[PDB]
Symmetry: C5
Subunit: 202 residues, 5 copies
């Protein structure tokens, strides 16, 4: 199989509307934010404008091919794939995707999608001009799929990709799993809570 | 039936342009706003910028399937479904949808669509910096369907951002029925009264 | 005929690119602006930001159906219909459509399209802070169809206007105008809408 | 032939990706800007925000029909036509098209496309608040076609339809042809240079 | 072969989702930025707004045709072609493409795509108001293809820079990097562009 055949097969049999659940178990989605820049911070309004790489991984076995005498991986437009319906609960702007909308698909059906996103958030900016800094929390989960359909887990240096030219610096990033049941609904929804501890440079 | 079969059936037969009336009775649409944030307020221009979850429910029997060895619910792109043509009569910006445009469909044909929307409104901002606060009224109804085709009803604060400069004192959501001079038919609306103020 | 059949018939035989002229007569398009809000006014730059409902009516006999055991009217996405190519000659921003892009079609082929539009205009803002107020003129007509293909005709001025605007409406007049350009032998029709408004005391 | 037949024929056989060259000669494109407004000027940054009608004409013989007992002209969405790939070399914003994206096609295959465009330019704003005014030069040519594929030529008062309510007034508009060969490339590229002499009122 | 036949063949067979690797050797992409304008600089936030032509070249042998009695080159919409998935690693806005999205294809399968882009970057603006100026570095490479699939290589200093900018260019250097990240076993190639510029004053 060459690249042309694999990408033809995916384009022709891609059900992008269809969550790829196996034997009624949830799709395991891994999510990790790599912070690249903090552009605007407002301690009065408690708003931040951030650029991050949203590292997103999951398995879709319908994509898989035999890798013997074939590529191990191909680049696929996300319009030809199912992608998790992830949303940031405290976003106050739409995600601005800065990068080409391609994912990497491995021959075993693993998908890696990592867009660069600029987005604005409502979060705690208090203490940004102090030594211990501000802690801005961002919650990301499936908008419509509960824990029996999608599970979200943080992935396996917090400032390795962060811009040296930002007015801000990162003290710490922690990424932890939450499972929440709301009054509306009988089912639990999973989320990754990302805590960005940052401060103004002196 | 698996998810793949249900979503194929819905894509092939859903008729997104066709209001799903039963026996010439109106489609009963429920609408409730959950306020998440108040971002900008201008007492001079009487304008507010708000983020809310627009909880929207209705029945479309053409979507229904036998649930007996099948999923009870699926996620469906709204482009594959009929959705009510709701508009806010006092909006001064287009709705900015912040979330994926998917609805939940139950095997009995019940649809739940709850987008997160950022939108600007013309409303009474007077008293925002006082103890009793401002009361901003938002009217939402069908743009083109009168009360014999679509009825809009409220369902009868909790998720408001603790980090807003503002706080919510009260939200009331009440039904209105309006006849305009132009037109013989009544149009239903939910009137949402947001009583809010600047934090001390 | 039920709604599903009518909307199927319209979607399948809709020629949205084809002006529905009858026997070589112009399509009569009626246009009336209902002002809802005046958001920003600049007396230095002579610019206004306005929200209005653009009530637009015309007949397309290709849409018609026998109403006798059928709905009298349906809601149709404008992407399935011919719509007049109206433009505001003094607009300085694109029309921001705030409402769902549906028109109402009557069984006789009458169409009503009424979008809520926010748009910015170049017009006379002088006198806005005086008792007699400013008069801002907005000209709306077909961008590409002359008077033998499209005629544009006008149909309480403050019945829909926001009580919470910084401005108030004194008067709205909507009158028919005709432009002939040097380039072209044909006249292009427009509705001229005169918005007399002022800052509230 | 009626309008419906002509627009069907154009939709079914228009190759919008195919430049309509005749007998290996260039497509002759005429371009004339009609200035409507000057909205924002910055003498520090040397930037202007302008609204203009970009009158664009060319021949496409593949569109032609016999006009005997048929319309002389139809309105066609530009998505169904080849359009020249014109760009303003000193634009610093994308063209904001304010009008419906329809062209006029004449039965002989002449196309007229005249969008209303709002766009920002890098140009000489020095002297805008003096009697002799500023001269802002805008160059428009094909982005990808050299002079053997596309020629651009200028076409009465270019300023006749300028807004009386602008803070600015037009002193003079000149529109002249340039043909440039760059070091990169063996072929010549044509452009129309438009010089807008304007000042604050 | 005429233009119509070549563009039909490309539209029918191009495979825009398929990287045109030969015998599992990388696609050689050449990238060179031609700086046209520096619009906004902020020494506090270390941000610049720049307009540049992104000269991009590569070979796709599936596009090739016999040039005997045929055009040597055609203009092709990039939606009908594979294009490299290039991104600027320090961009803080999406690329605003100011030009028509057409590439030039030579009969041997060479592609030239040169969009005019306005984009904002995070980079070192310190020293912009001094004689030696600021040096802003921009890194451009494939977002998803490593060095075994795409290689990126640099190809007259600042001849097309706007004379009306508040800034002037002292020097542009464009050098190749090959980077291995901790996450990933493969090396990713990038062109690093160093823009040495200062305020004219
Ligand atoms: C729908 O079409 C029917 C079928 O021909 C029309 O019914 C006729 O109407 C005429 C004229 O009024 C009567 O005198 C005939 O007896 C009817 N014939 C039948 C077979 O019913 C009907 O008029 C049409 N409906 C409308 C609203 O025009
Ligand atoms: O109806 C829902 C579903 C949802 C929507 C947001 N994503 C998780 C699932 O959560 C809710 C939260 C609050 C309310 Br009220 C309703 C709801
Ligand atoms: O024709 C209508 C119907 C509509 C359109 C949008 N609002 C709900 C239903 O209401 C009208 C309001 C004013 C005028 Br005039 C005409 C109309
Ligand atoms: O060629 C035309 C026709 C048109 C163009 C768009 N609006 C109405 C019809 O009107 C013109 C206006 C001015 C000039 Br100059 C040419 C023209
Ligand atoms: O340097 C060039 C070459 C180019 C780039 C656009 N595509 C055709 C070839 O044409 C130019 C047009 C204007 C200017 Br200034 C420079 C140039
Ligand atoms: C993959 O292909 C090789 C080569 O034909 C074969 O030996 C291997 O077992 C295959 N596995 C499959 C088809 O699952
Ligand atoms: C191309 O066409 C010419 C003349 O028609 C001929 O010399 C040649 O064989 C053709 N094929 C190739 C691959 O050059």
């Amino acid at each position: 199989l060459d690249r042309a055949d694999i990408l033809y097969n995916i384009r022709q049999t891609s059900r992008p509307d269809v969550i790829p659940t196996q034997r009624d178990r949830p799709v395991a989605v891994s999510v990790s934010l790599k912070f690249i820049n903090i552009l605007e911070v407002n301690e009065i309004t408690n708003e931040v404008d951030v650029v991050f790489w949203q590292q997103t991984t999951w398995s879709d076995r319908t994509l898989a091919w035999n890798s013997s005498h074939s590529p191990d991986q191909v680049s696929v437009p996300i319009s030809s794939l199912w992608v998790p319906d992830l949303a940031a609960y405290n976003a106050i702007s739409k995600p601005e995707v800065l990068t080409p909308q391609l994912a990497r698909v491995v021959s075993d059906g693993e998908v890696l999608y990592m867009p660069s996103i600029r987005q604005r958030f409502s979060c705690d900016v208090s203490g940004v001009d102090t030594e211990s800094g501000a802690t801005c929390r961002i919650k990301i989960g499936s908008w419509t799929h509960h824990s029996r359909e999608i599970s979200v887990d943080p992935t396996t240096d917090d400032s390795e990709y962060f811009s040296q030219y930002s007015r801000f610096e990162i003290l710490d990033v922690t990424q932890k799993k939450n499972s929440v049941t709301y009054s509306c609904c009988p089912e639990a929804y999973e989320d990754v809570e990302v805590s960005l501890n940052f401060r103004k440079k002196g």
